Design a protein around this ligand. Structure first.
Ligand SMILES: O=C(NCc1cccnc1)Nc1ccc(CN2C(=O)c3ccccc3C2=O)cc1
Ligand SMILES: O=C(NCc1cccnc1)Nc1ccc(CN2C(=O)c3ccccc3C2=O)cc1
Lengths: 470, 466
């Protein structure tokens, strides 16, 4: 990893473009104002700061390597070899940058400053926007954590309306997204961000990331259960789906087990295989070891409804204290297909309309949870707001005539909590008046060092829902 | 990196699930038939080299997996014996065989792209353990395919409006570094775009290619100097002309891309470029033009509005195909909201307004490298064949509610047909070689990469017919 090769190519050319005699470039990150995502979960910066920004990130080899690539890439000598050599000589390869950030886990309304970046040495005025590319990648854990939390709000609302409590809320949205993501690094990042709101993951990669960069009092940040896949059912032969089912439930008779039931026919598997042929191996299972029937195809809500009506006619359905239908404690369902924030809302609402409790279901989400997300969902944006040229500080911004939503903030910024509990980003250095109490941004990075860290437990507490706090 | 911790949790429990006395689990990858009629096979070599080759199992890695999984499942279900076996018998080298179509090959949907099987019966569970890591090849495949499809659109309209395909390799530039989920994804995605084009800003893609593939050229991708909002806006709202002037003067010998929408795109094209600094543009070389970059508003409407302005302030000719062409020292780049749908809308809208495609280049970020899923090409890995009690059976899924989710049966092979097209043979029928030899070469066997391809080879295989 070479930081000199970890920026957009045009940024190599930027030191020649700023006004001459520029000593300071001060930039900020926000999730611009426009399912509506009124508030965001700030998560993921600590990982970027530790893995890519801290310490001696510049060597004489990294400088020569970058110089060789750019001479070929640009078919010209644009690379600021002097500027990078200055950091190696004066700071021993440490970045003369200061990053102020809102605490990780914090839930902030859209259109507020979440972090700021500035150079601590006038010679490195160009360094502020060099590191934009790598810092803006924080849109991803921010976005995964916000959308995951938004799904938690739906799940918490419906579990409370149908059962009167939130038992098992942190295990109702499982991460199945490991194969559907673009890389091993993305898998670890995305899974850690879902782990801010939930405890269930199959993306093993996220456990190591939390352990390495955040830390938990608990041994592991995420848990899972044994489960079948199509290969372990179909491997038995079409006529032996019953034997596959029976072998798997016997092998995991004392822990919960998820068995994919749609390999040939989900309805027949529920009605005849689970409902009749092996009914005797289900009704015997413990409350702590249920069979979780997994449909994996067709219309998500239509399938969940039919599956529940089938199991209702084969197994004893009771009624909870809220008057909702409950499958016996040794029988549950998981819908791990076509699940996204939109279909999740549709299924729980469809189940509630049919008087089925949400205690009955869990959800699995892959691509919808970790991949089908973009930087534009939250309008995650990094912009220059303040510059010092010829010793004179100027408020800088953009304001495209065709898009007022692309209007950025002016000057030195600070985030504050109002007495009524609202959030305010004070522009043009107005925060120096101390009218709204202490600024919510804290220095997390300064001169190659991580100055402030957060544990995964702290993040989790900061990201808690209001329903959870009651 | 620990491969034992690089799978879906449930796959840790599968060894206890297969039929007793299973000596073989054979699986295959395909881009299931559902627009994207053919896919570019790209990216497996990166996965093979970085993650599966050599001693990937150690006593420590077994211990780390055992400790993690014990806590993860709140039960000891990890196959410690199974992995310890690979450690002792093979010195941590995976007893697996991967047969794949040559990288860069353009194959129609619903065809076997690659197969996976255990070379040792004790490792029947291994085949699907590595599904997770291998399925991630959906990403370079999908990126290379969607990039190739955009080149086909660009090829069609450039040929219609100009008469040639000059500078096609530089018409779709990569701006996606910031908008991807990680540094790894940046390198992976950018490398997959470079299979079809030469212009990238995602620097990470160059080192990946160099390390895993190789080019005769020193670099696989190129760029030009360009402004961003900060380099403009840092001059002050009253000094946008000054910013523009300084930038074009600093890069007077190379093409320079200058973002023109910081305040008013229409005024910057009409007044700043078209009047105040017009003397600094008309002097520029054909090999070093000014590239005006709008970055907001409706993509098609903004492009047409920008071109209409420049056409009034600069001399426009009518090319050999009857299409309007800006002077050679002046070009445009649309790098906002560009995906395969909007690119097609822009090139068709330009053609309709009699503007040539020689005038335009496209910049694509999130649409190029991020706004893509495994569902776009229906990328799937499934078990098609098992050997239980020494008898081989053809295995498959056939869900009642989704016939598209039906998978292939038995041992698979890929053949070239007499008409020069492709066919996937099922149930071991490929052994008869009616359409010649299997096109799937062994790329991986027992911790070894047995067959490699250079990026130049991949680029040659992925070429358009035109
Ligand atoms: O389905 C699967 N894996 C398949 C897979 C994995 C990866 C990719 N693609 C498909 N795993 C599974 C995991 C957690 C749960 C949640 N869960 C319950 O519903 C439940 C009810 C009662 C007690 C405890 C629990 C519980 O922990 C359910 C299923
Ligand atoms: O816009 C930008 N960077 C901004 C950016 C960068 C990263 C992220 N986000 C915004 N770069 C740019 C790059 C290539 C081209 C294409 N191009 C031409 O049109 C042309 C005409 C004649 C000679 C050579 C060329 C050429 O190479 C155009 C622009």
């Amino acid at each position: 990893f070479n930081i000199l090769l970890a920026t957009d190519s045009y940024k190599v050319t930027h030191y020649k473009q700023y006004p001459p005699n520029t000593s300071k470039v001060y930039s900020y990150f926000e999730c611009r104002e426009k399912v509506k995502y009124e508030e965001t979960v700030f998560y993921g910066l600590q990982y970027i700061l530790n893995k890519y920004l801290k310490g001696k990130v510049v060597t004489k080899e990294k400088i020569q390597e970058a110089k060789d690539v750019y001479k070929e890439h640009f078919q010209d000598d644009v690379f600021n070899e002097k500027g990078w050599n200055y950091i190696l000589e004066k700071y021993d390869g440490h970045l003369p940058i200061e990053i102020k950030a809102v605490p990780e886990g914090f839930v902030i309304p859209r259109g507020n400053v979440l972090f700021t970046v500035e150079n601590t040495d006038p010679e490195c005025y160009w360094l502020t926007n060099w590191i934009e590319t790598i810092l803006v990648q924080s849109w991803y854990p921010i976005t995964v954590a916000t959308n995951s939390r938004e799904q938690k709000k739906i799940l918490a609302k419906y579990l409370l309306e149908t059962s009167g409590n939130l038992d098992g809320l942190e295990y109702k949205l499982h991460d199945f997204g490991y194969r559907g993501v673009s890389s091993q690094e993305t898998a670890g990042i995305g899974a850690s961000a879902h782990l801010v709101n939930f405890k269930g993951t199959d993306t093993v990669a996220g456990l190591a990331l939390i352990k390495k960069y955040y830390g938990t009092k608990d041994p592991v940040p995420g848990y899972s259960v044994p489960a079948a896949e199509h290969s372990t059912i179909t491997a038995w032969g079409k006529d032996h789906e019953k034997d596959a089912f029976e072998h798997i439930v016997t092998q995991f008779s004392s822990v919960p087990v998820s068995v994919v039931s749609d390999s040939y026919d989900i309805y027949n598997a529920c009605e005849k295989i689970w409902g009749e042929d092996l009914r005797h191996l289900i009704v015997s299972r413990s409350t702590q070891a249920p069979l979780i029937i997994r449909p994996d195809s067709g219309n998500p809500l239509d399938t969940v409804l039919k599956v529940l009506e089938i199991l209702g006619k084969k197994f004893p359905v009771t009624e909870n204290s809220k008057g909702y239908k409950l499958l016996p404690p040794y029988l549950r369902v998981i819908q791990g297909d076509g699940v996204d924030i939109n279909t999740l809302q549709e299924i729980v609402e469809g189940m509630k309309q049919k008087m089925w409790s949400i205690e009955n279901i869990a959800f699995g989400s892959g691509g919808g949870l970790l991949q089908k997300l973009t930087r534009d969902l939250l309008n995650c944006s990094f912009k220059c707001s303040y510059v010092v040229t010829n010793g004179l500080g100027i408020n800088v911004f953009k304001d495209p005539v065709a898009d007022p939503n692309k209007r950025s903030k002016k000057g030195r910024l600070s985030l504050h909590r109002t007495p009524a509990g609202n959030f305010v980003t004070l522009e043009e250095g107005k925060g120096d008046l101390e009218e709204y109490g202490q600024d919510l941004l804290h220095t997390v990075f300064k001169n190659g060092k991580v100055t402030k860290s957060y544990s995964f437990d702290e993040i989790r507490k900061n990201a808690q829902l209001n329903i959870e706090l009651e």
